[PDB]
Design an enzyme around this catalytic site. Structure first.
Site, PDB file in Angstrom:
ATOM      1  N   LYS B 202      15.461   0.655   2.788  1.00 11.82           N
ATOM      2  CA  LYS B 202      16.587  -0.038   3.646  1.00 11.82           C
ATOM      3  C   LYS B 202      17.752  -0.506   2.562  1.00 11.82           C
ATOM      4  O   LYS B 202      19.256  -0.374   2.688  1.00 11.82           O
ATOM      5  CB  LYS B 202      16.166  -1.144   4.236  1.00 11.82           C
ATOM      6  CG  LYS B 202      17.268  -1.874   4.957  1.00 11.82           C
ATOM      7  CD  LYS B 202      18.093  -1.294   5.956  1.00 11.82           C
ATOM      8  CE  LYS B 202      19.234  -2.173   6.497  1.00 11.82           C
ATOM      9  NZ  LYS B 202      19.598  -1.680   7.699  1.00 11.82           N
ATOM     10  N   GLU B 208       8.192  -1.479  -5.000  1.00 14.87           N
ATOM     11  CA  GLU B 208       7.208  -0.155  -5.269  1.00 14.87           C
ATOM     12  C   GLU B 208       8.096   1.021  -5.179  1.00 14.87           C
ATOM     13  O   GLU B 208       8.106   1.958  -5.928  1.00 14.87           O
ATOM     14  CB  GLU B 208       6.181  -0.011  -4.178  1.00 14.87           C
ATOM     15  CG  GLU B 208       4.987  -1.189  -4.185  1.00 14.87           C
ATOM     16  CD  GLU B 208       5.526  -2.340  -3.152  1.00 14.87           C
ATOM     17  OE1 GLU B 208       6.535  -2.608  -3.024  1.00 14.87           O
ATOM     18  OE2 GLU B 208       4.538  -2.938  -2.665  1.00 14.87           O
ATOM     19  N   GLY B 263      11.081  -1.458  10.657  1.00 20.07           N
ATOM     20  CA  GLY B 263      10.321  -0.574   9.846  1.00 20.07           C
ATOM     21  C   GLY B 263       9.136   0.126  10.296  1.00 20.07           C
ATOM     22  O   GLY B 263       8.580   1.499  10.372  1.00 20.07           O
ATOM     23  N   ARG B 264       8.284  -0.736  11.092  1.00 17.22           N
ATOM     24  CA  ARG B 264       7.085  -0.158  11.613  1.00 17.22           C
ATOM     25  C   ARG B 264       7.313   0.541  13.212  1.00 17.22           C
ATOM     26  O   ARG B 264       6.382   0.908  13.869  1.00 17.22           O
ATOM     27  CB  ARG B 264       6.040  -1.452  11.813  1.00 17.22           C
ATOM     28  CG  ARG B 264       6.688  -2.776  12.781  1.00 17.22           C
ATOM     29  CD  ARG B 264       5.528  -3.821  12.716  1.00 17.22           C
ATOM     30  NE  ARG B 264       6.141  -4.940  13.233  1.00 17.22           N
ATOM     31  CZ  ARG B 264       6.884  -5.957  12.707  1.00 17.22           C
ATOM     32  NH1 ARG B 264       7.026  -5.726  11.245  1.00 17.22           N
ATOM     33  NH2 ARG B 264       7.190  -6.680  13.360  1.00 17.22           N
ATOM     34  N   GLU B 349       1.022  -6.168  12.161  1.00 14.16           N
ATOM     35  CA  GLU B 349       2.339  -6.906  11.547  1.00 14.16           C
ATOM     36  C   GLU B 349       3.247  -7.534  12.740  1.00 14.16           C
ATOM     37  O   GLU B 349       4.057  -8.335  12.367  1.00 14.16           O
ATOM     38  CB  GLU B 349       3.207  -5.871  10.756  1.00 14.16           C
ATOM     39  CG  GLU B 349       3.928  -6.386   9.876  1.00 14.16           C
ATOM     40  CD  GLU B 349       4.793  -5.331   8.809  1.00 14.16           C
ATOM     41  OE1 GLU B 349       5.601  -4.428   9.326  1.00 14.16           O
ATOM     42  OE2 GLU B 349       4.362  -5.402   7.519  1.00 14.16           O
ATOM     43  N   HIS B 380     -21.688   8.109  13.076  1.00 11.79           N
ATOM     44  CA  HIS B 380     -22.684   8.018  11.923  1.00 11.79           C
ATOM     45  C   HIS B 380     -22.371   7.168  10.820  1.00 11.79           C
ATOM     46  O   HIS B 380     -22.724   7.165   9.718  1.00 11.79           O
ATOM     47  CB  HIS B 380     -22.709   9.751  11.278  1.00 11.79           C
ATOM     48  CG  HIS B 380     -23.032  10.406  12.206  1.00 11.79           C
ATOM     49  ND1 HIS B 380     -24.266  11.165  12.643  1.00 11.79           N
ATOM     50  CD2 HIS B 380     -21.951  11.499  13.228  1.00 11.79           C
ATOM     51  CE1 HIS B 380     -24.383  12.096  13.512  1.00 11.79           C
ATOM     52  NE2 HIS B 380     -23.089  11.987  13.952  1.00 11.79           N
ATOM     53  N   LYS B 508       5.963 -11.422  -2.358  1.00 17.68           N
ATOM     54  CA  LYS B 508       7.109 -10.704  -3.200  1.00 17.68           C
ATOM     55  C   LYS B 508       7.543 -11.582  -4.211  1.00 17.68           C
ATOM     56  O   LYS B 508       7.659 -11.353  -5.379  1.00 17.68           O
ATOM     57  CB  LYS B 508       8.065 -10.351  -2.091  1.00 17.68           C
ATOM     58  CG  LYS B 508       7.651  -9.072  -1.235  1.00 17.68           C
ATOM     59  CD  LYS B 508       8.632  -8.587  -0.490  1.00 17.68           C
ATOM     60  CE  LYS B 508       8.166  -7.761   0.613  1.00 17.68           C
ATOM     61  NZ  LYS B 508       9.182  -7.266   1.513  1.00 17.68           N
TER      62      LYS B 508
END
Ligand SMILES: [Ca+2]
Ligand SMILES: [Ca+2]
Lengths: 543, 543
Positions: B202, B208, B263-264, B349, B380, B508
């Site tokens: 954005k 990252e 974003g999500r 979030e 399992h 951050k």
């Protein structure tokens, strides 16, 4: 029962200490020294947990008063501590380097472990060297493991985790789900003439593995049109010798599964052969050796300095006194992308039990949900809830000091984020801090007052950081073993059997009945269905 | 605040109904009709939940008394319901087919959505057709998406989920973590002359993504040794036009990110272009259309017949009255292997919040942990805990009636297992049943008495089954949208802002400070560290 109660009234009085992490680090210049441990090149930092000397002492006293010292000896010596199945619990013996005498139910465990490892080593060497040929005479290029649960997750996780160490020129594929998409993802990219398939199935009766095995066999035979080709393309890890021979596998290529190796503790056994097929047998031995290192630590070290015991005490303390119902595990390395999935089976299938050893329903909570996700990605998915939600969740971080490449700026940033997230959990940020920051950013007083409460981060939230020097076969083996033993300690303190799994039987039975009902709506099975199951079957059919 | 309290005293009296699922199905021959819904070819069966008519009525009355009706209108009409950021919440507009007038903060949302989709369609066509050439003149063969969180999980999940529909002859790769292993997995298998990279960021400031972008650019330029090559090999999805131009990307190839797309909630926007690069734009349109179908359902349907409202009510009822702290989601299809990971971000979030809209700390629990795993594999791994543990955990099953292959026996077994696991949760197996079974198996009375308690499965545990006819672009879009709206309803009932994420900011900031400390132990940053962080940095360095 007569066993010591771990989750007792005393545990609540520990939490009334009202530990404040910031205050503890401010006041106590020995905090890190007190609440950290080293094992070889693993550093275990539990100093951001909600403890002080008094709480830790109290917890350790509970461990000392419990049956734990006796139970550790009993595990390693082959006592039948899986008491509902009357079985020993000897995954430790799979990686032994001590060579001490161990004779259990007539077998010399040292000899049997060693001789089996030699058979697997020889198989891998014969295949990798090109001595093994398929039925048309070609060298093998691809290995397909067929198994589910215990016969899939550990090998798959380890193969990914040790990707930098792959060295056999074989590609290893994992087929597991009965959903045929799993089988097809392998079959789409392999050639029957150059593939060796592994059927990992104790009794040759696990439903998914049976259907996958038969469908793989049909694929192979559609190509070759000769039953004799099976012997050059399939091996088995099974005790069901008659069914293995009937499938067409040579009993020279049927590998051992002992009843004292639980499926969820089986990657160390012949079940792990797919690991060796990726990373070579020498690296598989290093994996084993790392686990042995932790076994020796666990077996020999006083509880106050014993990493798996401390891990277990902290976890059980939280789920007792804070009534938490999950734990988050956050591996800050891409290679560990299946680590959480693997430990979900090791932990939850072990400790999700409602009765004690005596069969009495327990009046305390036992195993909780294990979940998590690789960092830094989780920071952008669910850490919001770890920071500002209102659920109490203990957090483990796994950090790796050095990676397998020279992008040093990336590795530094990865670690800085890992450490920053545990620091954020500990400190938070108060209203006053936020409000002042907003004013300095250019907001007016009204705007800052309206926003600040939404940015407050309560903090005082616990974490553990486990730091490895590197992620090698040896260090990964050590890491997994730490959690194996944590799980054992917790089950001992809760007086449960960590080594059975009776809860899965009912669904297998009901699945057979539903298959019958799907094929015959006049059957007793269809008649006896609840109407939810019946209408789901109908919706499927009238598609 | 003045908002209706969802988790109130009345909710506890509902649980005193003491619902017994077996008894309800036995007594009520309309149970399935009452407690199931259909939307097109999705069947929503909530009849194995711990409800009866009275409980459901009570819950629906709470929805009717709440602000929910108004809030649904406000969402779709572009009101600034993200009240802490003063933003609209218009992921719905990304997939609109109604074409009704929508003018929000001066922009004609219909025109802006449509014109952007046309730009993305044209990009994908130009690349897939071979009209786009790299700087040496070659056709593109590989697409590398660089993004994290919102800019990674949805595209990655959808690309995998719709693998049978891949049709562009491009291979699509996802780089996300700052851990350079992520970038390297892509770079190891792509050629700079035939790769097009997407920077999804954005503000061009996400740490990252910035490091990954710069390192990708360095790789490209190490090959070409000409800055001009960037324009043929990179596009961006960003609002930060100056930084995009400075990187060397043509602003013709900078795609839009609107502030009203979280974003999500962004895979439906230009952020989803990597989906189109795998499955073609026509299939991306079908994905959108499936979501629209559910948007229309949600917007128009009375609450008693509204699937996302029922999903939300059940979830919030459980986490209020049973004090549960997690929910399990169990997709019985390999293709849905990233579905849980994706919904962990969408759900946690959004709803991991501790203050209401007014900024007051809430005295009730809000969003819980979402976890789970693909079936049948989870059977399992962790279903043991779902069956015999002592944690209350609501369970959703996702079943797909028909797959993408002709291994009909495998598909039938997959479904039979899915239905068997919800049936096992409902019925369990009692001591008497088990004991009699053990006698019939050949155990004597002493042996059967010692074992039976360990095999008892309490049952009466809830589940929902969502059955799709098939897993297509359209049906997947519908499925995701159902959960988007569930999450919205829950946040409305809890009087929180589902659309902000202030909790991630602190980490951050602390990460920048720790990076400085790692590079300079004389800095104020290093001096100000807590000693845990300081000693972790030291352990890394003295490696
Ligand atoms: Ca003692
Ligand atoms: Ca109303």
């Amino acid at each position: 029962s007569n066993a010591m109660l771990f989750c007792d009234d005393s545990k609540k009085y520990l939490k009334e200490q009202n530990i404040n992490l910031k205050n503890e680090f401010d006041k106590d210049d020995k905090r890190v020294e007190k609440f950290s441990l080293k094992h070889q090149n693993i550093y275990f930092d539990y100093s951001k947990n909600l403890i002080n000397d008094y709480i830790l002492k109290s917890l350790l006293e509970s461990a000392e008063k419990s049956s734990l010292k006796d139970k550790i000896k009993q595990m390693f010596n082959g006592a039948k501590i899986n008491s509902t199945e009357h079985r020993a619990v000897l995954h430790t013996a799979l990686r032994d380097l001590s060579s001490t005498p161990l004779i259990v139910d007539g077998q010399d465990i040292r000899q049997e472990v060693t001789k089996e490892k030699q058979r697997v080593k020889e198989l891998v060497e014969k295949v990798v060297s090109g001595r093994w040929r398929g039925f048309s005479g070609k060298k093998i290029t691809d290995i397909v493991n067929i198994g589910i649960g215990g016969s899939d997750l550990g090998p798959k996780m380890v193969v990914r985790a040790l990707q930098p160490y792959h060295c056999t020129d074989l590609k290893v594929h994992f087929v597991s789900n009965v959903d045929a998409d799993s089988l097809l993802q392998a079959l789409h990219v392999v050639d029957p003439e150059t593939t060796l398939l592994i059927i990992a199935s104790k009794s040759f009766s696990t439903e998914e593995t049976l259907l996958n095995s038969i469908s793989a066999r049909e694929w192979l035979l559609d190509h070759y049109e000769d039953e004799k080709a099976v012997a050059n393309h399939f091996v088995a890890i099974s005790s069901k010798l008659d069914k293995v021979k009937e499938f067409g596998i040579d009993l020279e290529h049927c590998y051992k599964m002992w009843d004292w190796v639980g499926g969820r503790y089986s990657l160390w056994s012949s079940i792990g052969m797919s690991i060796a097929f990726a990373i070579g047998y020498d690296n598989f031995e290093k994996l084993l050796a790392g686990a042995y290192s932790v076994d020796k630590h666990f077996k020999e070290t006083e509880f106050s300095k014993n990493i798996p015991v401390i891990m277990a005490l902290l976890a059980s303390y939280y789920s007792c006194t804070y009534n938490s119902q999950s734990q988050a595990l956050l591996p800050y390395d891409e290679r560990l992308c299946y680590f959480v999935d693997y430990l979900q089976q090791a932990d939850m299938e072990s400790n999700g039990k409602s009765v004690n050893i005596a069969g009495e329903t327990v009046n305390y909570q036992t195993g909780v949900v294990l979940w998590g996700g690789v960092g830094t990605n989780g920071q952008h998915a669910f850490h919001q809830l770890l920071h500002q939600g209102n659920i109490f969740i203990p957090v483990d971080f796994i950090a790796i000091a050095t990676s397998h490449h020279n992008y040093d700026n990336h590795q530094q940033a990865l670690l800085a984020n890992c450490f920053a997230q545990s620091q954020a959990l500990m400190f938070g940020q108060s209203y006053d801090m936020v409000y002042n920051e907003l004013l300095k950013s250019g907001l007016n007083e009204t705007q800052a007052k309206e926003l600040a409460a939404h940015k407050v981060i309560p903090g005082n939230r616990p974490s553990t950081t486990i730091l490895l020097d590197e992620l090698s076969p040896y260090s990964l083996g050590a890491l997994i073993a730490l959690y194996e033993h944590k799980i054992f300690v917790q089950g001992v303190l809760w007086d449960i059997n960590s080594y059975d799994q009776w809860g899965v039987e009912l669904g297998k039975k009901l699945g057979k009945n539903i298959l019958k009902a799907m094929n015959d709506d006049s059957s007793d099975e269809y008649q006896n269905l609840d109407d939810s199951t019946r209408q789901l079957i109908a919706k499927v059919k009238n598609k």
